[PDB]
C-alpha cells in the first residue's frame, strides 16, 4: 500500500485553463492498476508496488505531451510506509482523530 500525489503541469500552453490537459493525464492513469482521487491541488494515488506507480506516472506525463504540450513540469510525492498499511482515507482519519 503506497500513497502518492501527482501533478502534471504543461507549460507555455497559451491558456490559463489546464483542465483538459489534466483530464488527459488522468485518463492515461486510469489504464494502470492504481486507485486515484482527483483533489484540488493534484491527483492522489494508491498503488501496490513502485513499478505500477512509476508506470502510471510515466503514462500520465506522456499523455500531456501527446496532448500537444511542448513542456511538461511533473511533480510526484511518494509516501511509502512499510511498518503499517495506510491508504489515503486511513491517513486522513488518523489526523482528524487526533484533532
Swiss-Prot record:
Q: What's one GO-annotated cellular component?
A: cytosol
> This protein is called what?
UPF0045 protein MTH_1187
The entry sums up its family as follows: Belongs to the UPF0045 family.
Alphabetical list of NCBIfam families matching this protein: MTH1187 family thiamine-binding protein
Q: Which residues form a coiled coil?
A: none
Q: How does it assemble?
A: Homotetramer.
Source organism superkingdom:
Archaea
Q: Which InterPro entries has this protein been placed in?
A: MTH1187/YkoF-like, Thiamine_BP, UPF0045_domain
What Gene3D superfamilies does this protein map onto? 3.30.70.930
Amino acid at each position: 500500500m503506497i500513497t502518492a500525489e501527482l501533478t502534471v503541469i504543461p507549460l507555455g500552453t497559451c491558456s490559463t485553463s489546464l483542465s483538459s490537459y489534466v483530464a488527459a493525464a488522468v485518463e492515461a492513469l486510469k489504464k494502470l492498476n492504481v486507485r486515484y482521487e482527483i483533489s484540488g491541488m493534484g491527483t492522489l494515488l494508491e498503488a501496490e508496488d513502485l513499478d505500477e506507480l512509476m508506470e502510471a506516472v510515466k503514462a500520465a506525463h506522456e499523455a500531456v505531451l501527446q496532448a500537444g504540450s511542448d513542456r511538461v513540469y511533473t511533480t510526484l510525492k511518494i509516501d511509502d510506509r512499510r511498518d503499517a498499511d495506510r491508504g489515503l482515507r486511513d491517513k486522513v482519519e488518523s489526523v482528524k482523530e487526533k484533532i
